[PDB]
Design a protein around this ligand. Structure first.
Ligand SMILES: COc1ccccc1COc1cc(C2=NN(C3CCCCCC3)C(=O)C2(C)C)ccc1OC
Ligand SMILES: [Mg+2]
Ligand SMILES: [Zn+2]
Length: 329
């Protein structure tokens, strides 16, 4: 009834679960490619979610193994490691001092479940690709947030798998509320929603009210869900805020995926996609553009909302940006 040595080496890495820049690739290795399951299980136990939602532990493991196995191992970026990373990054953002005791357990379960399922069964190509190839998914979702709609439908459908209904003890009221929030969060991961989300977060920072403590006040669904939507969106776009050893691994992976969409886009023609070309397409400028135009304005606005909790994260992003800038020949 004691851990194996590999289980123990894994238990020791998972002690970093509450820290920005967890060695997520190492956890993936030590767990036998089970990062999503071991990280979700650790977070559920730490936030006491099994007792609060009366989730049988074997049901939780069954669902999490099932969920992880619906991520594609043959997709370099949008796989179970990315899922694990966004789960663990959302977990750290939820622990930020500016949000202490703001969110209910159901809101916490929604953000973490949303993060776990947010890219499930990703085929490793974009919405535009699926629309332009006349793919079944694009036809199913009438070309609207195609992948995001699929990730939701899969994440929920998997609850019907033998001993996979982790929500089996929630009331109808709990499940309707949980489901709506989970849908709202994942749909918000569609990049076509980024500018509207960032605008609403900027509006929120301008109108920012604060409580008896230094803790944010959010007194309506609109505001509560907007913060959770932008939190998970920040987690999803958190790669350039990580130590460079991590960021670089993620960039290689997104480039493999993008170059391979690039490869398929050539013999199919439709025309190549924003800097998705191993030829006239440079990695270092693509990262500096991404940080300047998307990641920095998002993480700066987030940093404003929870000031000063996100200072170290924003610094790491600015160093990483200066790093990629410096490497441009
Ligand atoms: C112009 O930037 C890029 C061009 C080509 C290769 C890579 C990039 C930036 O590197 C990353 C990009 C993304 C994404 N970017 N996008 C798309 C892509 C096209 C336009 C840029 C934003 C919208 C996404 O949906 C995700 C979240 C997968 C995620 C992690 C990245 O690095 C770790
Ligand atoms: Mg996605
Ligand atoms: Zn994602």
């Amino acid at each position: 009834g004691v851990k194996t040595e590999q289980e123990d080496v894994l238990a020791k890495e998972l002690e970093d679960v509450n820290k920005w820049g967890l060695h997520v690739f190492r956890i993936a290795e030590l767990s036998g490619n089970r990062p999503l399951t071991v990280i979700m299980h650790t977070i559920f136990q730490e936030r006491d979610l099994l007792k609060t939602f009366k989730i049988p532990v074997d049901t939780l493991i069954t669902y999490l193994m099932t969920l992880e196995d619906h991520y594609h191992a043959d997709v370099a970026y949008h796989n179970n490691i990315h899922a694990a990373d966004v789960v663990q990054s959302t977990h750290v953002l939820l622990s930020t001092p500016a949000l202490e005791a703001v969110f209910t357990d159901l809101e916490i379960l929604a953000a973490i479940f949303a993060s776990a399922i947010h890219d499930v069964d990703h085929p490793g190509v974009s919405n535009q690709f699926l629309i332009n190839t006349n793919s079944e998914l694009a036809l199913m979702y009438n070309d609207s947030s195609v992948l995001e709609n699929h990730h939701l439908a899969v994440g929920f459908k998997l609850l019907q798998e033998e001993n996979c209904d982790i929500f089996q003890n929630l009331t109808k009221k709990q499940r309707q509320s949980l489901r709506k929030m989970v849908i709202d969060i994942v749909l918000a991961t569609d990049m076509s929603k980024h500018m509207n989300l960032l605008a609403d977060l900027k509006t929120m920072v301008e109108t920012k009210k604060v409580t008896s403590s230094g803790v944010l006040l959010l007194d309506n669904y609109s505001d509560r869900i907007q913060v959770l939507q932008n939190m998970v969106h920040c987690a999803d776009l958190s790669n350039p805020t990580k130590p460079l050893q991590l960021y670089r691994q993620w960039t290689d992976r997104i480039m493999e995926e993008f170059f391979r969409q690039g490869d398929r886009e050539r013999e199919r023609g439709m025309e190549i996609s924003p800097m998705c070309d191993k030829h006239n397409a440079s990695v270092e400028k693509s990262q500096v553009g991404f940080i300047d135009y998307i990641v920095h304005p998002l993480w700066e606005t987030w940093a404003d909302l929870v000031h000063p909790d996100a200072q170290d994260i924003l610094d790491t992003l600015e160093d990483n940006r200066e790093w990629y800038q410096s490497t441009i020949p």
